[PDB]
Amino acid sequence: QISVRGLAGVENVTELKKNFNRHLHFTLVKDRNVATPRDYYFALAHTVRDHLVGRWIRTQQHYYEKDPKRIYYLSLEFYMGRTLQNTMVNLALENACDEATYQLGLDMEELEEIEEDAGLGNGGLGRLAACFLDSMATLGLAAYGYGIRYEFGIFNQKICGGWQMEEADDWLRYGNPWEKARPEFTLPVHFYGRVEHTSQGAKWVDTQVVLAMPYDTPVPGYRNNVVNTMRLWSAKAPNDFNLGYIQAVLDRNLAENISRVLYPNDNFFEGKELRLKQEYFVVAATLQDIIRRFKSSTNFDAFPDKVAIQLNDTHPSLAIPELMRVLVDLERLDWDKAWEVTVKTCAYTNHTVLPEALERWPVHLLETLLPRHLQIIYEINQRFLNRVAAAFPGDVDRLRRMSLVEEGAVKRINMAHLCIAGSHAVNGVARIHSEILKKTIFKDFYELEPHKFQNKTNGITPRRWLVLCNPGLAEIIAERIGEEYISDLDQLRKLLSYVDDEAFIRDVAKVKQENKLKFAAYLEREYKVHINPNSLFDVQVKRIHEYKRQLLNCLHVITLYNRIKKEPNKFVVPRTVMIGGKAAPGYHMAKMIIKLITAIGDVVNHDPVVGDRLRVIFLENYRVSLAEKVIPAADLSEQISTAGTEASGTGNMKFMLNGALTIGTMDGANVEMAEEAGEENFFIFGMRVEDVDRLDQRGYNAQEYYDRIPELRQIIEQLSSGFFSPKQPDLFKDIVNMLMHHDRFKVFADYEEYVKCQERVSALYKNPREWTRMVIRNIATSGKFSSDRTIAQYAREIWGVEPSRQRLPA
Amino acid sequence: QISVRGLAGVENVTELKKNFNRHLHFTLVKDRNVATPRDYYFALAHTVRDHLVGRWIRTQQHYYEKDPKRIYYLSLEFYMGRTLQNTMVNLALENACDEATYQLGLDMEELEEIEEDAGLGNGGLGRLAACFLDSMATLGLAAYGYGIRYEFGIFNQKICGGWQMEEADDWLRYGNPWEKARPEFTLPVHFYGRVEHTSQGAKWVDTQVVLAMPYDTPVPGYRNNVVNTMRLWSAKAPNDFNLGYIQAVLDRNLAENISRVLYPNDNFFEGKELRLKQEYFVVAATLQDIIRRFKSSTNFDAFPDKVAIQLNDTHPSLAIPELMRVLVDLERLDWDKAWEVTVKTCAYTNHTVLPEALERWPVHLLETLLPRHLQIIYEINQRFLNRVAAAFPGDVDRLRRMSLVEEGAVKRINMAHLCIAGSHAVNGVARIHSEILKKTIFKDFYELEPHKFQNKTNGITPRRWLVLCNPGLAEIIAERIGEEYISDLDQLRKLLSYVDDEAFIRDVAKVKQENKLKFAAYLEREYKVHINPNSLFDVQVKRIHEYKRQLLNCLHVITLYNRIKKEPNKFVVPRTVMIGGKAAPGYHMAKMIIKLITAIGDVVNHDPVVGDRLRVIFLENYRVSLAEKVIPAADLSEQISTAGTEASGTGNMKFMLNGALTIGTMDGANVEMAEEAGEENFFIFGMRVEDVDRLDQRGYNAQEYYDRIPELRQIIEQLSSGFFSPKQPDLFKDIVNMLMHHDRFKVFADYEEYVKCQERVSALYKNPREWTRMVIRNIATSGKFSSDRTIAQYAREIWGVEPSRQRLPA
Numbered sequence A, B: 001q002i003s004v005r006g007l008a009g010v011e012n013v014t015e016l017k018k019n020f021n022r023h024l025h026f027t028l029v030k031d032r033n034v035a036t037p038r039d040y041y042f043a044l045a046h047t048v049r050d051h052l053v054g055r056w057i058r059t060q061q062h063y064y065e066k067d068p069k070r071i072y073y074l075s076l077e078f079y080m081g082r083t084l085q086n087t088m089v090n091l092a093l094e095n096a097c098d099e100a101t102y103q104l105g106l107d108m109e110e111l112e113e114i115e116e117d118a119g120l121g122n123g124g125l126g127r128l129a130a131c132f133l134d135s136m137a138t139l140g141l142a143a144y145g146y147g148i149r150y151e152f153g154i155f156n157q158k159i160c161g162g163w164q165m166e167e168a169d170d171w172l173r174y175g176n177p178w179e180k181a182r183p184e185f186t187l188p189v190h191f192y193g194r195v196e197h198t199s200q201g202a203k204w205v206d207t208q209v210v211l212a213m214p215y216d217t218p219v220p221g222y223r224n225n226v227v228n229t230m231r232l233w234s235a236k237a238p239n240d241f242n243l244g245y246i247q248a249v250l251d252r253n254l255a256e257n258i259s260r261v262l263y264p265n266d267n268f269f270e271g272k273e274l275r276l277k278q279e280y281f282v283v284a285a286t287l288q289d290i291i292r293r294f295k296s297s298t299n300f301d302a303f304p305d306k307v308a309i310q311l312n313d314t315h316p317s318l319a320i321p322e323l324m325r326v327l328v329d330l331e332r333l334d335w336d337k338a339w340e341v342t343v344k345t346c347a348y349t350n351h352t353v354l355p356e357a358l359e360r361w362p363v364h365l366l367e368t369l370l371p372r373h374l375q376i377i378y379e380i381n382q383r384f385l386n387r388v389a390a391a392f393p394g395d396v397d398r399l400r401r402m403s404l405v406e407e408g409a410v411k412r413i414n415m416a417h418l419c420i421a422g423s424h425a426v427n428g429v430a431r432i433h434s435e436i437l438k439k440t441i442f443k444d445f446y447e448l449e450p451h452k453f454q455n456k457t458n459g460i461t462p463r464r465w466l467v468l469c470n471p472g473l474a475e476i477i478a479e480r481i482g483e484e485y486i487s488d489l490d491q492l493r494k495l496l497s498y499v500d501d502e503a504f505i506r507d508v509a510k511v512k513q514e515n516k517l518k519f520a521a522y523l524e525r526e527y528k529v530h531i532n533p534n535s536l537f538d539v540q541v542k543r544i545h546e547y548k549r550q551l552l553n554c555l556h557v558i559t560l561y562n563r564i565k566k567e568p569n570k571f572v573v574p575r576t577v578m579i580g581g582k583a584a585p586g587y588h589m590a591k592m593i594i595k596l597i598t599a600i601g602d603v604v605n606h607d608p609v610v611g612d613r614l615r616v617i618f619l620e621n622y623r624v625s626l627a628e629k630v631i632p633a634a635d636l637s638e639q640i641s642t643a644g645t646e647a648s649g650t651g652n653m654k655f656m657l658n659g660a661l662t663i664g665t666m667d668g669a670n671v672e673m674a675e676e677a678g679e680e681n682f683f684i685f686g687m688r689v690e691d692v693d694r695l696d697q698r699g700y701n702a703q704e705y706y707d708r709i710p711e712l713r714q715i716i717e718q719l720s721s722g723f724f725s726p727k728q729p730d731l732f733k734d735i736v737n738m739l740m741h742h743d744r745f746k747v748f749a750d751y752e753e754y755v756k757c758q759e760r761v762s763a764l765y766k767n768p769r770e771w772t773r774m775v776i777r778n779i780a781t782s783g784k785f786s787s788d789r790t791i792a793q794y795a796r797e798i799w800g801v802e803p804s805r806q807r808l809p810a
């Protein structure tokens, strides 16, 4: 069908069809009279997985023989999504399977829709993990993702009467054809117990044992025959466990609960024991696996030349005292030497500066659960604070600020402080974010060790986020410049000499129109909701958080509605405003925000005066596979975090890649996107970081905006008075209250400039042709935002390994 | 190698080898450098399972087209053991795989040893289920086993300092290649709630929902290409379940605990809620599956002509009120008609008369858990007691004795009474057992409905219990008479004209000698224990229970030991006495018995005066696959239950089939075995049933035996005084106590006659040739004890279907 989806050679198609029928008969134990479309999905999925395995085995073999430095990416989240289409794209099988399945009388696309998302993440942090893995394999690095195999991932979101309801995400119900259980590599992990001191050193004893059983998932590189491994641990009880006989067997579940469920908090710390067990679990089991692999090559000086461990935020920060524990207590190296190895091995990536998101573990927790690690942490803190003392003599306030140990109410360990002390490199995830670390929360650490601090601006994989979700756009780009851009995204610059080409202008507009027709139809079929496809598609999708200011967007929507009612017969550029995202379960304000959005939709969508000029849709169950549909269909990308709060953002990059214009604050990667496209090709508004700081020190008084801006006062009164909630007049008193008296994110301060920048957007949209040329200018400069670039920088500047675009033999 | 294991045709062997390598590469994702013998087992197992599936699909299809009456065997236990070798035997693949694996440089036998037993049963009742399934498939009946898929089966037994220790049997750890999950046929099952009465009839509401997910296991017939289905249900939570978010997800395990673990009590009732949930669960989910299958053929008069449900004891007795519930509350048939259908559909098999084993459920339990079923039960009891009243007017004591409802302390439902009332046929499991039912516990029910009562003497499958475990013996039998006996065991009679053939005598003795050498070597390799293979192998293996009188055997062993010490230089026929079996966890006396046995072994096995004349070995972890090794190696089979307590026994049959002589009481099937072999070819001793009854009514006084039998007094004093437990002189005071004052099983009363019958055994053993001719006479008359005969009788006399030895096409 389309040229970027590979060859459909007669030999391949005939071969695919017979393996499909074999799996249906032998693996699935069905015949064609009883098979449902789900069985068809599995047969296709098993048939596609056969193509990986040979490559997977050879790649693991090549690494054994060639013995390169290995990268270990430790993360509590891997937000993978579906694997089938991605696997086909990376093996060039897409058109062959399309053809093969067509001939069997099946629709491949209808089959793809049956696959469950692997939702083993919350949002951006877990999704960066997934892009990173795809990029490591594409660049031929000998790289292993390590995490937890959660039985339940991020919950499924349902809306009932405008409120979010949470349902268990039972993603394994039908089986997962992508994983291979490896019970032969089960490893013990210890908890509780106590520390004995001997002649021979410390010993950790009387521990409970949880077993960690690994599951391997293949991660294929783009068309290079590399297939790396994502290893996820599952918790299993030992067999003498407790060993009522009955009750002892039933209690085996208290051990296995460690890997049962992903914690649904995003940018918010919760200090729960079960979460700490999860953190230790992945770290303890992964380090033994790493040491084991290293011993099959006694002399640990070469350890840092054979091993890099990346920490995906502070979730796996216990890797640091754990590496020490093993090195000092079990291998019996002296402190100083183990410490050199540790620092040289480990590196730390920070993903936020929000105070409520940082990990600070109560000492009484570590004390019970991990008494040895606490001793090690105390020792680390003591020797660290002696370097600080020595370099800044007499500065006693520095010592209390830098301490890994926080005093006060209950003593806590600051886990970020631990990571900085124990890593040779620390990085933020966009340039402005990295500067903020150096200027604010990590300032003291920077003056002590400037050479640790770096930036590695985030990116996204152009395989999932362009080829896979947007084949139409990929195809027209490939007609003009070839296919090489898919693994070298900088090549999109060449699209700049097509900015005045009339055929290209029309092709970009045509693709966008198709994606919108397809998305509108998906809204009607799967959610009985009616949208006008000629409207501007104004979309904000990401987790629900006050810092992301979904509330700012709400105020704009209500403003547009009020203007329509004031002058009904005046022309306005019509929009569909879509907003989506999950709220963490205990986060009451986020849940109120979701309810406000649908309340606004109840009023606006049923006003006959509005017609099809304005539509407000809340997109249910936002997740990876829903992003692959809505992103290509969007015209305006909303990236409107208060400046200084969005560390980087990655959705922003998804939208730029796929031909939507961006309205955004100078926050996070937005600053670098605008700089790449040129600020003229970007809808920038609102306070900079500097302005936010000026307003803080003076005092943020919301009443001031409410007094000076009549459009805003009318919205607040409408909110206060029951206009959007006629049966519960006082439903939104929490929101108005926070807006008026405790807004940490200054929603009013950006309101005026946001509404005005929004009119500039509608104006550009009235001129289809200039809208599209600006789109071409975005797409054409999105190259920097490939995770291949991000990973090459990690490889050269942190891991000390060289990337490779070379094919391995087939 | 041996002719009964099929052809090894060049085409088959070449084909087997390539599928083996395919599975190793594609299913297991290993290559030959990294594979361990466990991977080899799996590759063989997957390669063998491919041969079933085509047959499995065609058999399920044939039943759809031909629409015969279906048999449903409902049981809480399926004691399957290993599947690989059995599968090869039934498909005639054994020598081909042997050859195929030989050429790949593997030992098939070493591979077979890696398979976990499916220990989803306790002992004889669960094992009869397994023989029955094999026989139903061999006889071409359209028959389905239904049960629970336990995550943990009967516990693994370890001995630590002579005491039993219990370990979780984690049989699924590595996966089960034999089962196919079928999550598409998940069914809801209800609990708790309450009953509402409407205009329209009763409604059961406000229930908790547990989902039942089915797993299908193939059951292949012998060489006839029939492959039937064993369907086992797993408990799953619904997704809105509880829906802390965290805690709600973790609590999903309270629902799934239903299928977590098999209750380890054998011949002992425990009234625990979790057990009742298990019973309802299998019954509720199986009946919907049955009704569903029946509707794909509204008029329920034909239901009994399309469906038979066998109840494997009273465990699934709730099938009766449940069938009523569905028929009356959901299909809205009137009471009388639903009741006719129910009785005509259901039949009940009783497996014991022991009072402590019978199920009597406290009403307060059914009331909370199954309020509707209780109402239905009350109604059943009322209409039943009106037939009784009408047929025996004024007999008020009969009414209290026959009531499904027992009065007293706490009210209970007698589940046996329910089964008799609601079934068209009730059967015991051996002739004497069936007469006892008619004369004692079910006498009143018999006078009301004589036509319900039948006998169906148990049997065992000659495929597992001869061909599979004893190929040597099968081969020499086949040389003389052909192969047809394997599915027509009555043909072994022909062996009678070989009783005076010198070559046959030597071949039978030679096989026995081989099995003993092989078993002795298995004892040294796997348990570092040293045995003399020229000794008589005296074996008692079965669950540990006072009724089975392992204690009687102990007294004999101690007697032999004391005779040796009295006259050390007198010749005695040397023996290895092996005793094995599991004790239920809370059954203190059974655990004392195990400890006594090993205590006897500590003394006897280290006395230099004894030499290798007497050895006492306790066989650890007795289970199905350990039975397939020890049974063919045995000379004397010990079947020594007090007369009237062993309903049938089936081990007894295993041993007769495999060339051991039997020492036994006239109990259970022993009566019919002796009658088939001739009492001269059998070592019968002790009280008959009549004698036991005479002693009861007079009073059993143990002191009397202790006063008259000096050999016995010496054993008791030795026990009392610390001879067998030097460090805890009083260790066995519980045993001596029970023996002296509360023996419900009259161990002393049979002691004298047992010791004397034992000397007669040693005497016959001194003359190898006459020992062997007696063996030939046993083997040759074991035909009656084929479960094919048992099942043909169930088919003709209860189910109303005709068996079929016809091959289905390949």
Ligand SMILES: CCCC#Cc1cn([C@@H]2O[C@H](CO)[C@@H](O)[C@H](O)[C@H]2O)c(=O)[nH]c1=O
Binding pocket: A122, A123, A124, A125, A126, A128, A265, A266, A267, A268, A313, A314, A315, A351, A352, A357, A358, A359, A429, A458, A646, A647, A648, A649, A650, A668
């Ligand atoms: C203990 C660690 C806590 C921190 C954090 C988190 C950061 N990010 C996102 O991480 C994404 C990947 O770097 C960024 O693009 C985005 O700006 C940022 O909010 C998340 O999506 N969730 C988080 O919990």
Ligand SMILES: CCCC#Cc1cn([C@@H]2O[C@H](CO)[C@@H](O)[C@H](O)[C@H]2O)c(=O)[nH]c1=O
Binding pocket: B122, B123, B124, B125, B126, B128, B265, B266, B267, B268, B313, B314, B315, B351, B352, B357, B358, B359, B429, B458, B646, B647, B648, B649, B650, B668
């Ligand atoms: C509620 C039902 C209770 C009863 C019973 C049981 C019977 N049998 C055995 O069932 C075997 C199969 O019929 C017999 O050979 C044997 O004599 C008998 O003890 C068991 O092995 N376990 C039992 O629990």
